[PDB]
Design a protein around this ligand. Structure first.
Ligand code: FES
Ligand SMILES: [K+]
Ligand SMILES: [K+]
Ligand SMILES: [Mg+2]
Ligand SMILES: [Mg+2]
Ligand SMILES: [Mg+2]
Ligand SMILES: [Mg+2]
Ligand SMILES: [Mg+2]
Ligand SMILES: [Mg+2]
Ligand SMILES: [Mg+2]
Ligand SMILES: [Mg+2]
Lengths: 58, 100, 97, 122, 86, 137
RNA sequence: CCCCACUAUGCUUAGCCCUAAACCUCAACAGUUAAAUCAACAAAACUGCUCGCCAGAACACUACGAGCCACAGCUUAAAACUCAAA
């Protein structure tokens, strides 16, 4: 457990943690807000509000 | 000698066209929203086509275009419904601009 | 009365009914090449009709023919005979991404 | 009726295979069968290893025997094939050409079922 | 046991990429239903319980496929409001 | 030539080689991934045992045997004994959906072995013995 | 309840036993979608005709009698006492 002999391995684990930290910081801005691909439930439910299923007669 | 409704219907272009699938028709752009082109082609409902990537600036209000029809009215009955759901618009593919 | 009134008749524009790829063809338990086109290459499992596109009558004939061919010594059970891996792919399924 | 004998024979030389086919066709005739044709499907590798008569087999000769016979001859022939040491596996099925395939008009579409629930408001 | 080996459920590794080969194998076993089959066989599912599960899974497929068909049918209507202000 | 995920069929003429050996000559690593343990045995193409290791033989006990890190340790132990006998390339045959299914294969790679193919042989009866009754939890 | 082991039992043969939330709790046959559409819920509302069955709750899948290869069984099946509800 002497850090002097494990510098390259400690550094790699540190750099990875920082890169995984920034990526975690961006995953929120992009995937949560942009709604890439399929719509989110909230947006998809607004679309169903406009064309409700009609199981009765009018 | 007043023409009856039955005679008008028999000789109307929409009746003479038969099925609308894969039929080439001429449309007219009457409304534009960003890149959404609203096109009337003589049917009950209009169709909404996206502005093509090539010569996009040539598609303006009043421009006459060529369409390939797919359906005059998009409707469908879904599980449990008593009537069909309709989006109140036709289905067509924008081919290009009509020119003389 | 009036010549322009509609007339009663059958839909002239009606499209012919669609047919499965095996409509009108004999399914034999000895034709292992044909039967192999409807089983999984990796597990030998028989594909359902939503994958094979066959109608109800032919999905049944294919199923019965495979089960017969397997136990009579014509067709393997746990995999698709490798000799038939380059036959026309008629089933709707993809295993590689 | 008309039957079809799917016969898988032990991988042997031509003389012993001819003696086995003759011995098998005569067993059918002795039971009142009218043999119509004999087809050779070729020697191949079995789809799986088959154990028959205290022996393991990986290859076999596939043969078909189309014949007519009384209904009581099938049971007696199945018992005969079980004792022939040169037969790996033999099955008798009703000839597939007797079953006439009915004509098919095509696929009739099935519409979504309607009126499965009353139209009252829920 | 009596079949040939290294044919069924076998995937070749490409360029030493063992992770992608394992994911391909797992995807094959899943699509063919072998994974769910193995799990359901760890304990005996009584016949009446299996019939109830199959009925539940079939009703779920019908509902999910109909909801998906309606979503794809209405997705074109998710465009911008053409009559904003009216 | 395009890559084929299907293995080469014995008897046919294939161009694939691994250290001059054909697919039928590569040793086999049998991995049994149970719910509470993982056992790894490396054998030659002629079925000669070359190395064996399990989570139990590597000092793990009770619930610790049924972990991924225990299976990875067993994979490294089996690869070490197999590499001494001249094994480089192996064909992996894994059976069972235990927690050491994928970890055991990582240990084999960490130990210096190269996996050229993966085969699942998890036993699936086609109708078989009745399994034990369900648990009340 | 969880873990392990093992038996009757699950299988075959020959006889019994005759029960189930044996319920899709929706009797068979014929017909209708119009009128008043309909307590509620459930799986829309009805017509003709026939057989079976039901009449507060509990006592009671009980007692007694009778029948049955059934002997701690099955089928048929009450009453008294009790309550103003169920
Ligand atoms: S549609 Fe005719 S047999 Fe399949
Ligand atoms: K009853
Ligand atoms: K029920
Ligand atoms: Mg016992
Ligand atoms: Mg049995
Ligand atoms: Mg029942
Ligand atoms: Mg009755
Ligand atoms: Mg009472
Ligand atoms: Mg009782
Ligand atoms: Mg009693
Ligand atoms: Mg009594």
């Amino acid at each position: 457990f002497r850090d002097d002999a494990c510098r390259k391995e400690i550094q790699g684990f540190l750099d990875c943690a920082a890169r995984a930290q920034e990526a975690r910081k961006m995953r929120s801005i992009q995937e949560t807000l942009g709604e890439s691909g399929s719509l989110l439930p909230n947006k998809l439910n607004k679309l169903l509000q406009r064309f409700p299923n009609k199981p009765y007669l009018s | 000698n007043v023409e009856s409704f039955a005679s008008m219907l028999r000789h109307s272009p929409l009746t003479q066209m038969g099925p609308a699938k894969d039929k080439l028709v001429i449309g007219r752009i009457f409304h534009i929203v960003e890149n959404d082109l609203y096109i009337d082609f003589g049917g009950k409902f209009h169709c909404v086509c996206r502005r093509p990537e090539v010569d996009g600036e040539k598609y303006q209000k009043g421009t006459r275009v060529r369409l390939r029809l797919l359906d005059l009215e998009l409707t469908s009955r879904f599980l449990g419904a008593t009537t069909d759901t309709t989006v109140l618009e036709a289905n067509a593919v924008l081919l290009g601009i009509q020119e003389s | 009365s009036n010549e322009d009134l509609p007339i009663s008749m059958e839909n002239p524009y009606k499209e012919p009914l669609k047919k499965c790829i095996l409509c009108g063809k004999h399914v034999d338990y000895k034709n292992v090449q044909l039967l192999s086109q409807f089983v999984s290459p990796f597990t030998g499992c028989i594909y359902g009709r939503h994958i094979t596109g066959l109608c109800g009558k032919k999905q049944k004939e294919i199923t019965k023919a495979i089960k017969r061919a397997q136990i009579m010594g014509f067709m393997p059970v746990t995999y698709k005979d490798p000799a038939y891996l380059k036959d026309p792919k008629v089933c709707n399924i993809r295993y590689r991404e | 009726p008309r039957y079809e004998l799917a016969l898988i024979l032990k991988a042997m030389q031509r003389p012993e295979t001819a003696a086995t086919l003759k011995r098998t066709i005569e067993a059918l005739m002795d039971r009142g069968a009218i043999v119509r044709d004999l087809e050779n499907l070729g020697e191949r590798a079995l789809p799986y290893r088959i154990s028959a008569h205290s022996q393991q087999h990986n290859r076999g000769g596939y043969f078909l025997v189309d014949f007519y016979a009384p209904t009581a001859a099938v049971e007696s022939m199945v018992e005969h094939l079980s004792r022939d040491i040169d037969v790996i596996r033999g099955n008798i099925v009703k000839h597939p050409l007797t079953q006439e395939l009915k004509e098919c008009e095509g696929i009739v579409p099935v519409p979504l079922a309607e009126k499965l629930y009353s139209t009252k408001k829920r | 046991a009596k079949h040939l080996k290294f044919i069924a459920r076998t995937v070749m590794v490409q360029e030493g990429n063992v992770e992608s080969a394992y994911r391909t194998l797992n995807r094959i076993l899943t699509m063919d239903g072998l994974i769910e089959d193995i799990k359901h066989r760890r304990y005996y599912e009584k016949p009446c319980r299996r019939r109830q599960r199959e009925s539940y899974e079939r009703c779920r497929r019908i509902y999910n496929m109909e909801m998906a068909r309606k979503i794809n049918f209405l997705m074109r209507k998710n465009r911008a409001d053409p009559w904003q202000g009216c | 030539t395009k890559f084929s995920i299907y293995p080469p069929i014995p008897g046919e003429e294939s161009s694939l080689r691994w250290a001059g050996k054909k697919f039928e000559e590569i040793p086999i690593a049998h991995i049994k991934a149970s719910h509470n343990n993982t056992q790894i045995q490396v054998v030659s193409a002629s079925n000669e045992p070359l190395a064996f290791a399990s989570c139990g033989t590597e000092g793990f006990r009770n619930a610790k045997k049924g972990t991924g890190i225990a299976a990875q340790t067993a994979g490294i132990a089996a690869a070490a004994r197999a590499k001494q006998k001249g094994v480089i390339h192996i064909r992996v045959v894994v059976k069972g959906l235990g927690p050491g299914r994928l970890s055991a294969m990582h240990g084999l790679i960490m130990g210096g072995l190269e996996v050229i193919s993966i085969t699942d042989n998890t036993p699936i009866p086609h109708x078989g013995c009745r399994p034990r009754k369900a648990r009340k939890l």
